[PDB]
């Protein structure tokens, strides 16, 4: 499948 | 040929692409508990995380088919993206219920029930056209 577009998770 | 996964954060709620590396036997830590499976897993994009445990309820086959805006239904249970503390911004897989949908020759709006874990309701989606089906049985 196609990589999703996603965002990247932050940090505290 | 394959065998690919969406492995699912336990905290945020969100579904993220993810490998299987083990399934190992969980033997019960209590009488109340039975012996189940265990799935170690890694995110694709965060290997930094290492691998993670979880269970079969957070993890299942790797979204494959879009539905399209026009196929679209209230009362759909789907994987949409939603970024909860900056909704007008991309954001994270989340399960969901489409709530609301609305369709002029200007503008497309869609409303949903975003699954966090807790529950959102009536979340303005941004990316109508990004719209999954979630894999089963």
């Known amino acids: 499948i196609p ?3 996603t965002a990247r998770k932050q940090l505290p | 040929v394959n065998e690919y996964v969406d ?5 945020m709620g969100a579904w993220f ?3 299987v590396v083990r399934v190992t036997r969980k033997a019960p830590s209590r009488p109340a508990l039975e ?3 265990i799935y170690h897993v890694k995110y ?14 957070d993890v299942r086959a790797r979204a494959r088919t879009i539905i399209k805006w026009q196929d679209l239904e ?37 409303y949903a029930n975003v699954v ?18 979630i894999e089963r049985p």
Not at chain 2, 7 to 11: H, L, M, Q, S, V
Not at chain 2, 77 to 102: C, H, Q, T
Request: hydrophobic share 30%; net charge negative.
């Open chain 2, 7 to 11: 492995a699912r954060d336990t905290n």
């Open chain 2, 74 to 110: 209230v009362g759909q249970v789907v994987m949409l993206n939603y970024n909860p503390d900056n909704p007008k911004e991309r954001g994270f897989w989340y399960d969901a219920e489409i709530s609301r949908k609305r369709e002029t020759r200007t503008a497309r709006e869609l």
């Open chain 1, 3 to 5: 990589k999703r577009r």
């Open chain 2, 44 to 57: 694709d994009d965060y290997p930094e995380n290492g691998v993670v445990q979880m269970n079969s309820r």
């Open chain 2, 17 to 19: 692409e993810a490998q």
């Open chain 2, 116 to 133: 966090l874990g807790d529950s959102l309701n009536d979340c303005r989606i941004i990316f109508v056209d990004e719209v999954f089906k």
């Open chain 2, 35 to 37: 012996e189940d499976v």
